[PDB]
Coordinates of C-alpha atoms (C1' of nucleotides) and ligand atoms in Angstrom, one line a residue:
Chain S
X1 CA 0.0 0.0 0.0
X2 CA 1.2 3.5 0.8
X3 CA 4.0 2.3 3.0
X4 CA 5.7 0.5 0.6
X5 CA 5.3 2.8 -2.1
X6 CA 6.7 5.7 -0.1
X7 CA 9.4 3.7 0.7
X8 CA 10.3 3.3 -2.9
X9 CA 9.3 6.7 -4.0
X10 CA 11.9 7.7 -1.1
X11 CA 14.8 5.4 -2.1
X12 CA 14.3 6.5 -5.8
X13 CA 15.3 9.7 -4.4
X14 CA 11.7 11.6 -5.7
X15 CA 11.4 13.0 -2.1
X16 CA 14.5 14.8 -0.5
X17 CA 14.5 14.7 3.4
X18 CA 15.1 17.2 6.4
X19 CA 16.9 15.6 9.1
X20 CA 15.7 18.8 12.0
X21 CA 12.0 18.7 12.9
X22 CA 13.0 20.8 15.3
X23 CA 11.8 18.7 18.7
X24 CA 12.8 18.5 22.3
X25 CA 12.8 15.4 22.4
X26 CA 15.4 12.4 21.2
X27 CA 13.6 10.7 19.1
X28 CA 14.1 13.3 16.1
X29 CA 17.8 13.2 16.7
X30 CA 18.3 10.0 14.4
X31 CA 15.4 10.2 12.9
X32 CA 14.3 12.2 9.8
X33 CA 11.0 13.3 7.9
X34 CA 10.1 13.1 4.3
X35 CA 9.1 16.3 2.2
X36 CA 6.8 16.4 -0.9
X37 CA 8.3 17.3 -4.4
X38 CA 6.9 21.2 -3.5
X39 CA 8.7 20.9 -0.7
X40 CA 6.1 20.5 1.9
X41 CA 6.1 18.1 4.9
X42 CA 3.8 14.7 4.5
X43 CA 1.6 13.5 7.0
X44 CA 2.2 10.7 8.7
X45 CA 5.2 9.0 8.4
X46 CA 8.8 9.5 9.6
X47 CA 12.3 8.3 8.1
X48 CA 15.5 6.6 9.9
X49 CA 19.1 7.7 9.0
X50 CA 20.6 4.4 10.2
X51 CA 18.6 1.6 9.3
X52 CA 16.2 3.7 6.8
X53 CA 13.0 2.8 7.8
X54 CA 9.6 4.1 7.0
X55 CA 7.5 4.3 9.8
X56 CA 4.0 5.3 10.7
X57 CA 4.0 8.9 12.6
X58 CA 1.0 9.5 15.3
X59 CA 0.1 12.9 16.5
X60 CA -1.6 11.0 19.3
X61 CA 1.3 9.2 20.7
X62 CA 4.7 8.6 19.5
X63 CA 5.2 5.7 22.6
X64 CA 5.6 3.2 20.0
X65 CA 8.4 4.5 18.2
X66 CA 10.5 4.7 21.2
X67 CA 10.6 0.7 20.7
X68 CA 12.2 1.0 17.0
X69 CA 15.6 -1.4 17.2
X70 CA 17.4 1.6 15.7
X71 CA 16.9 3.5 19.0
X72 CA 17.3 0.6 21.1
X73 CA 20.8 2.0 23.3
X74 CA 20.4 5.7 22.4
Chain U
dC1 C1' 9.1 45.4 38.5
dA2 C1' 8.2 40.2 40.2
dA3 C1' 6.3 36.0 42.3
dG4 C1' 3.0 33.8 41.9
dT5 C1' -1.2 30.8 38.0
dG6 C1' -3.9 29.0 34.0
dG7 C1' -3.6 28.2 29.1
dC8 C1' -2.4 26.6 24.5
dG9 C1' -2.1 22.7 23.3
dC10 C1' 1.7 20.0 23.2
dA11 C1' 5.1 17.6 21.9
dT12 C1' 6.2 13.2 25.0
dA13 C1' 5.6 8.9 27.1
dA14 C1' 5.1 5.2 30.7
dG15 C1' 0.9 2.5 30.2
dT16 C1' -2.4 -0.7 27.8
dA17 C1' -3.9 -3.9 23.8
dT18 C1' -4.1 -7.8 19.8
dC19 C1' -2.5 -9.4 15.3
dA20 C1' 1.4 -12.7 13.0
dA21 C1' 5.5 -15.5 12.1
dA22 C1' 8.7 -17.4 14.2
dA23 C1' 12.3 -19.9 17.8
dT24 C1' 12.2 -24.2 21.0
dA25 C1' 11.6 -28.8 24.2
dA26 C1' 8.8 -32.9 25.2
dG27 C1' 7.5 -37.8 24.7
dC28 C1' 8.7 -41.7 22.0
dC29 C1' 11.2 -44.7 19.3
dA30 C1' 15.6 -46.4 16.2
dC31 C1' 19.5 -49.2 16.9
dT32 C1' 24.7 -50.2 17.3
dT33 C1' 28.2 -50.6 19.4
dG34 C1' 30.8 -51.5 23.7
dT35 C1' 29.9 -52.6 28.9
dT36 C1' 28.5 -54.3 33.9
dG37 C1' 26.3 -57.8 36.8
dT38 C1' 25.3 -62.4 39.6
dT39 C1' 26.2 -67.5 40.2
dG40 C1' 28.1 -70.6 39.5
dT41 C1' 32.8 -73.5 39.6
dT42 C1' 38.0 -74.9 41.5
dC43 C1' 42.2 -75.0 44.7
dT44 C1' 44.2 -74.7 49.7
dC45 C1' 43.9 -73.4 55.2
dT46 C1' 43.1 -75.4 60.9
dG47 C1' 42.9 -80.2 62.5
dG48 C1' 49.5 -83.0 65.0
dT49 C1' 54.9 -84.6 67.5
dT50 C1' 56.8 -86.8 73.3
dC51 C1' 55.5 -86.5 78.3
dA52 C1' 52.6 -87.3 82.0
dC53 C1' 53.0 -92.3 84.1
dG54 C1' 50.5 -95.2 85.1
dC55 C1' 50.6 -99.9 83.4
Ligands
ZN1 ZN1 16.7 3.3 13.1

DNA sequence: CAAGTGGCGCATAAGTATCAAAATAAGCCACTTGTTGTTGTTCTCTGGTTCACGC
């Protein structure tokens, strides 16, 4: 679906990325976000810089992602 | 001025959940070499050297 398309749109180097969301937190310290070709943010999802994984990005709660392997000794 | 609060959400997070695809041990049986166990047999040891002793 839309993950796995992203994630080639992204490796086919359609989308750039910006590596600062600008966050207090340390979860945005290896982790990256993934910008439309007008250069706007997409909703949503979030990008690695390690392991370059897409993942699903909650407003809500971003618990979950604190359990990605990436982040697993940071 | 300055020590005291709400507020605007607010970006964070220690909690909870269920939906999958894997990583493991349990009970049994194969079966082939090597390996341990009673329960028999078979050959010596002690029968004994001269003194009390009456017959
Ligand atoms: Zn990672």
């Amino acid at each position: 679906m839309d993950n796995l398309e992203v994630k080639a749109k992204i490796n086919q180097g359609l989308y750039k990325i910006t590596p600062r969301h600008k966050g207090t937190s340390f979860i945005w310290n290896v982790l990256a976000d993934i910008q439309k070709e007008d250069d706007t943010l997409v909703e949503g999802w979030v990008f690695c810089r390690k392991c370059e994984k897409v993942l699903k990005y909650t407003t809500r709660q971003t618990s979950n992602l604190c359990r990605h392997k990436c982040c697993a000794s940071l």
